[PDB]
Amino acid sequence: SLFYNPQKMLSYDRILNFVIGARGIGKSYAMKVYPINRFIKYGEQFIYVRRYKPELAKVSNYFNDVAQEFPDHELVVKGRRFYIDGKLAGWAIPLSVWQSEKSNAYPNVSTIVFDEFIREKDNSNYIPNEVSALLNLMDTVFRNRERVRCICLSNAVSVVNPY
DNA sequence: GTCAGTCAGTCAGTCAGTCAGTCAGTCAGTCAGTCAGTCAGTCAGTCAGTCAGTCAGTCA
Ligand SMILES: Nc1ncnc2c1ncn2[C@@H]1O[C@H](COP(=O)(O)OP(=O)(O)OP(O)(O)=S)[C@@H](O)[C@H]1O
Ligand SMILES: [Mg+2]
């Protein structure tokens, strides 16, 4: 039809979804809307992993394209941290130092709100055995079997990546 | 005892068979003379910790 449509993805309800495609074509649109939809339902905060640190200095305008989705309530960023009507929205950090984070309490998670997990022809960015790095990330955002649902999202379809 | 001979040994003659030098393709051998990926240094650039400069939340 018109845009990226996560309805079937949300429907078939894997505890861990895995979608690919639509480079910039809303593959991030609906999935950045969804955490704020959980916030309007008043659920839990989300976790935003980043590939590296400079990628963080410019990305504070993460809610610009979801206002036209939900003009109603307040969706802003105070700085590094995201605030919806002033309540904490996203725990936003690149990869380098998640270990120092992993002793902190992380009681509230809603959904995986990152994409371009893996870039085509890009392994200089990569970290050795980062598949187990995502394992540490998930177990340090797990408290039970609930509150979490994950997605992968690569720009294109390949059959060579280790995952 | 002459005329001089007319059917076997005899020697003038081969006559196809014979040995083995002598070049000879040729033989893969081979070993060595040519040549094609292999790595080390150095060139440009990616990480994630510094400096250390600065608009600004709690106060004079
Ligand atoms: N529900 C929607 N309403 C309007 N536009 C949408 C919708 N879903 C997707 N889009 C389109 O998606 C675009 C932005 O999507 P993105 O968030 O960039 O997706 P993306 O594929 O992650 O690209 P990047 O690399 O993350 S910026 C918009 O400009 C629209 O063209
Ligand atoms: Mg995206």
Short mmCIF file of C-alpha atoms (C1' of nucleotides) and ligand atoms in Angstrom, two decimals:
data_model
loop_
_atom_site.label_atom_id
_atom_site.label_comp_id
_atom_site.label_asym_id
_atom_site.label_seq_id
_atom_site.Cartn_x
_atom_site.Cartn_y
_atom_site.Cartn_z
CA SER A 1 0.00 0.00 0.00
CA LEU A 2 1.55 3.24 1.25
CA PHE A 3 4.09 2.80 4.07
CA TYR A 4 5.92 0.31 6.23
CA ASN A 5 3.32 -1.74 8.11
CA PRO A 6 4.36 -3.60 11.29
CA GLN A 7 0.93 -5.16 11.88
CA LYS A 8 1.81 -8.70 10.76
CA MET A 9 5.13 -8.47 12.61
CA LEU A 10 3.38 -7.53 15.85
CA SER A 11 0.67 -10.11 15.09
CA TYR A 12 2.55 -13.37 14.64
CA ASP A 13 4.15 -12.44 17.96
CA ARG A 14 7.55 -13.94 18.26
CA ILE A 15 9.10 -12.93 21.55
CA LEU A 16 11.95 -11.94 19.21
CA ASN A 17 10.95 -10.66 15.76
CA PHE A 18 13.40 -10.55 12.84
CA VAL A 19 12.62 -8.31 9.84
CA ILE A 20 14.78 -6.97 7.00
CA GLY A 21 14.53 -4.45 4.18
CA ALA A 22 13.25 -0.98 3.32
CA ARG A 23 16.47 1.01 3.56
CA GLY A 24 15.25 4.26 5.09
CA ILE A 25 11.77 3.36 3.79
CA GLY A 26 10.03 3.48 7.13
CA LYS A 27 11.87 0.43 8.42
CA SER A 28 12.63 2.77 11.33
CA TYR A 29 9.44 4.88 11.15
CA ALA A 30 6.85 2.51 12.63
CA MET A 31 9.36 0.95 15.04
CA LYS A 32 10.27 4.35 16.46
CA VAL A 33 6.57 5.21 16.70
CA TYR A 34 5.82 2.01 18.64
CA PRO A 35 7.77 2.83 21.85
CA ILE A 36 5.88 6.12 22.12
CA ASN A 37 2.67 4.16 21.51
CA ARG A 38 3.62 2.01 24.50
CA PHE A 39 4.23 5.26 26.40
CA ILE A 40 0.76 6.56 25.50
CA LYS A 41 -0.48 3.24 26.84
CA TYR A 42 1.92 4.11 29.72
CA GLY A 43 4.07 1.00 29.54
CA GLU A 44 7.84 0.93 30.02
CA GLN A 45 10.94 2.74 28.78
CA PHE A 46 12.98 1.47 25.83
CA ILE A 47 16.69 0.78 25.29
CA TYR A 48 18.60 2.32 22.35
CA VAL A 49 21.93 0.75 21.43
CA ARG A 50 24.17 2.64 19.04
CA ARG A 51 27.00 1.35 16.88
CA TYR A 52 29.41 4.14 17.87
CA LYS A 53 29.73 7.38 19.81
CA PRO A 54 29.82 10.23 17.23
CA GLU A 55 26.55 8.87 15.79
CA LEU A 56 25.05 10.15 19.06
CA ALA A 57 25.87 13.87 18.92
CA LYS A 58 23.38 14.58 16.11
CA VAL A 59 20.54 12.13 16.75
CA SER A 60 18.61 14.08 19.41
CA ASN A 61 15.80 14.72 16.89
CA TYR A 62 14.52 11.16 17.14
CA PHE A 63 10.84 12.14 17.60
CA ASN A 64 10.49 14.59 14.70
CA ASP A 65 8.83 12.10 12.35
CA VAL A 66 6.48 10.65 14.99
CA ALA A 67 4.78 13.97 15.79
CA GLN A 68 2.81 13.69 12.55
CA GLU A 69 1.88 10.28 13.95
CA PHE A 70 0.93 11.55 17.44
CA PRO A 71 0.64 15.35 17.54
CA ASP A 72 -1.29 15.17 20.82
CA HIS A 73 1.11 14.84 23.74
CA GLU A 74 4.58 16.15 24.57
CA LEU A 75 7.43 14.27 22.85
CA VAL A 76 10.80 15.96 23.45
CA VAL A 77 14.44 15.34 24.36
CA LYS A 78 16.14 17.07 27.27
CA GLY A 79 19.61 16.32 25.94
CA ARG A 80 20.98 12.80 25.90
CA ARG A 81 17.80 11.48 27.51
CA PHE A 82 14.39 11.34 25.83
CA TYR A 83 11.31 12.64 27.66
CA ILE A 84 7.63 12.08 26.91
CA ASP A 85 5.59 14.63 28.88
CA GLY A 86 8.73 14.78 31.05
CA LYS A 87 8.88 11.07 31.88
CA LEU A 88 11.98 9.08 30.95
CA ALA A 89 11.66 7.42 27.55
CA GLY A 90 14.90 5.96 26.22
CA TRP A 91 18.16 4.67 27.69
CA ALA A 92 20.45 5.81 24.86
CA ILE A 93 24.07 4.65 24.61
CA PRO A 94 26.45 3.24 21.95
CA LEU A 95 28.12 -0.15 22.35
CA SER A 96 31.56 0.67 23.75
CA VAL A 97 30.72 0.59 27.46
CA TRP A 98 27.61 -1.57 28.02
CA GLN A 99 29.61 -3.64 30.51
CA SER A 100 29.87 -0.69 32.91
CA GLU A 101 26.09 -0.40 32.54
CA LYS A 102 25.33 -4.05 33.23
CA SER A 103 25.38 -3.76 37.04
CA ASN A 104 22.68 -1.07 36.96
CA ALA A 105 19.03 -1.85 37.60
CA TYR A 106 17.02 -2.04 34.36
CA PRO A 107 13.50 -2.89 35.58
CA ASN A 108 11.60 -1.35 32.65
CA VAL A 109 11.98 -2.33 28.99
CA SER A 110 9.33 -2.31 26.27
CA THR A 111 10.74 -3.13 22.82
CA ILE A 112 13.85 -3.12 20.65
CA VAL A 113 13.96 0.35 19.06
CA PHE A 114 17.20 0.13 17.04
CA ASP A 115 17.78 -0.64 13.38
CA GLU A 116 20.70 -1.04 10.98
CA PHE A 117 21.91 -3.75 13.33
CA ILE A 118 24.23 -5.03 10.60
CA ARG A 119 25.36 -3.00 7.58
CA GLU A 120 26.12 -4.57 4.22
CA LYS A 121 29.88 -4.71 3.57
CA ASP A 122 30.65 -3.22 7.00
CA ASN A 123 32.78 -5.20 9.45
CA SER A 124 35.27 -2.51 10.47
CA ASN A 125 32.42 -1.19 12.63
CA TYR A 126 31.74 -4.72 13.90
CA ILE A 127 32.92 -6.16 17.22
CA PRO A 128 34.17 -9.78 17.46
CA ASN A 129 31.38 -12.20 18.40
CA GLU A 130 28.89 -9.36 18.77
CA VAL A 131 26.13 -11.98 18.54
CA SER A 132 27.01 -12.90 22.12
CA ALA A 133 27.24 -9.18 22.83
CA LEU A 134 23.56 -8.94 21.99
CA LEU A 135 23.13 -11.93 24.31
CA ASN A 136 24.65 -9.95 27.18
CA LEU A 137 22.50 -6.97 26.19
CA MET A 138 19.32 -9.05 26.26
CA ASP A 139 20.13 -10.73 29.56
CA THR A 140 20.89 -7.29 31.03
CA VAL A 141 17.50 -6.09 29.83
CA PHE A 142 15.68 -9.26 30.99
CA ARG A 143 13.87 -9.59 34.32
CA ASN A 144 11.28 -12.22 33.34
CA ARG A 145 9.81 -13.64 30.13
CA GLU A 146 7.74 -10.49 29.54
CA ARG A 147 8.16 -6.74 28.84
CA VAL A 148 10.56 -7.50 25.95
CA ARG A 149 10.14 -8.05 22.23
CA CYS A 150 13.08 -7.80 19.86
CA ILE A 151 13.71 -7.11 16.19
CA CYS A 152 16.64 -7.40 13.88
CA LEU A 153 16.70 -5.14 10.85
CA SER A 154 19.31 -5.23 8.09
CA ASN A 155 19.03 -2.98 5.05
CA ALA A 156 19.15 -5.86 2.54
CA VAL A 157 18.81 -9.65 2.51
CA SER A 158 21.97 -11.75 2.71
CA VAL A 159 22.73 -15.38 3.51
CA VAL A 160 26.38 -15.08 4.57
CA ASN A 161 26.31 -13.26 7.93
CA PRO A 162 27.09 -15.55 10.89
CA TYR A 163 23.74 -14.95 12.61
"C1'" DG B 1 97.74 -99.50 -81.71
"C1'" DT B 2 94.06 -94.50 -84.05
"C1'" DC B 3 89.20 -91.16 -84.74
"C1'" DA B 4 87.58 -88.57 -80.57
"C1'" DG B 5 83.84 -89.31 -77.05
"C1'" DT B 6 79.72 -88.52 -74.22
"C1'" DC B 7 77.88 -89.17 -69.18
"C1'" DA B 8 80.56 -88.65 -63.80
"C1'" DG B 9 84.23 -85.33 -60.73
"C1'" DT B 10 85.64 -80.64 -61.17
"C1'" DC B 11 86.07 -75.31 -60.60
"C1'" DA B 12 84.51 -70.60 -62.46
"C1'" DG B 13 80.12 -68.60 -60.69
"C1'" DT B 14 77.15 -67.14 -58.47
"C1'" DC B 15 72.57 -65.71 -55.15
"C1'" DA B 16 69.96 -65.12 -52.54
"C1'" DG B 17 70.87 -65.37 -47.32
"C1'" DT B 18 73.93 -62.76 -43.23
"C1'" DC B 19 76.27 -59.64 -39.41
"C1'" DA B 20 76.21 -55.95 -37.24
"C1'" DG B 21 78.20 -50.56 -37.52
"C1'" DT B 22 76.12 -46.52 -37.72
"C1'" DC B 23 73.44 -42.87 -37.93
"C1'" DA B 24 68.83 -41.81 -35.79
"C1'" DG B 25 64.21 -40.64 -34.08
"C1'" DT B 26 63.47 -40.22 -29.88
"C1'" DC B 27 63.09 -40.62 -25.11
"C1'" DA B 28 61.50 -39.23 -21.10
"C1'" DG B 29 65.07 -37.14 -17.98
"C1'" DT B 30 66.54 -33.50 -15.99
"C1'" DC B 31 68.33 -29.75 -14.35
"C1'" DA B 32 68.61 -25.39 -14.72
"C1'" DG B 33 67.16 -20.94 -16.55
"C1'" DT B 34 62.79 -18.16 -16.57
"C1'" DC B 35 58.73 -16.29 -14.16
"C1'" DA B 36 54.34 -15.35 -10.49
"C1'" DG B 37 52.13 -15.29 -5.89
"C1'" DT B 38 54.07 -14.01 -0.94
"C1'" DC B 39 55.05 -11.08 2.49
"C1'" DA B 40 56.94 -6.48 4.82
"C1'" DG B 41 56.83 -1.35 5.03
"C1'" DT B 42 54.54 2.25 4.33
"C1'" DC B 43 50.42 5.06 2.53
"C1'" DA B 44 45.92 6.43 2.99
"C1'" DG B 45 42.03 5.83 6.46
"C1'" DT B 46 38.47 3.33 10.26
"C1'" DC B 47 38.07 2.87 16.25
"C1'" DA B 48 37.06 5.18 21.58
"C1'" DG B 49 39.90 7.64 24.89
"C1'" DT B 50 42.34 12.20 25.87
"C1'" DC B 51 42.67 17.50 25.75
"C1'" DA B 52 40.58 21.44 27.47
"C1'" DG B 53 37.01 25.25 25.59
"C1'" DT B 54 32.64 26.44 26.61
"C1'" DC B 55 26.47 28.08 27.32
"C1'" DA B 56 24.88 27.25 31.64
"C1'" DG B 57 21.45 25.27 37.78
"C1'" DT B 58 22.08 26.03 41.86
"C1'" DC B 59 23.28 30.54 44.44
"C1'" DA B 60 26.02 36.45 45.97
N1 LIG C 1 3.20 5.37 9.02
C1 LIG C 1 3.93 6.15 8.22
N2 LIG C 1 3.48 7.39 7.93
C2 LIG C 1 4.21 8.17 7.13
N3 LIG C 1 5.37 7.90 6.54
C3 LIG C 1 5.80 6.67 6.84
C4 LIG C 1 5.15 5.75 7.65
N4 LIG C 1 5.88 4.57 7.74
C5 LIG C 1 6.93 4.80 6.98
N5 LIG C 1 6.95 6.04 6.41
C6 LIG C 1 8.02 6.53 5.53
O1 LIG C 1 9.26 6.31 6.17
C7 LIG C 1 10.07 7.49 6.10
C8 LIG C 1 10.98 7.55 7.31
O2 LIG C 1 11.28 6.21 7.71
P1 LIG C 1 12.65 5.85 8.40
O3 LIG C 1 12.47 6.05 9.86
O4 LIG C 1 13.80 6.64 7.77
O5 LIG C 1 12.90 4.33 8.06
P2 LIG C 1 14.37 3.72 7.91
O6 LIG C 1 14.16 2.66 6.83
O7 LIG C 1 14.95 3.27 9.21
O8 LIG C 1 15.41 4.73 7.29
P3 LIG C 1 16.53 5.22 8.27
O9 LIG C 1 17.92 4.75 7.75
O10 LIG C 1 16.28 4.60 9.68
S1 LIG C 1 16.52 7.17 8.41
C9 LIG C 1 9.07 8.63 5.99
O11 LIG C 1 9.66 9.76 5.36
C10 LIG C 1 7.97 8.02 5.14
O12 LIG C 1 8.24 8.18 3.75
MG MG C 2 15.77 3.25 11.23
#
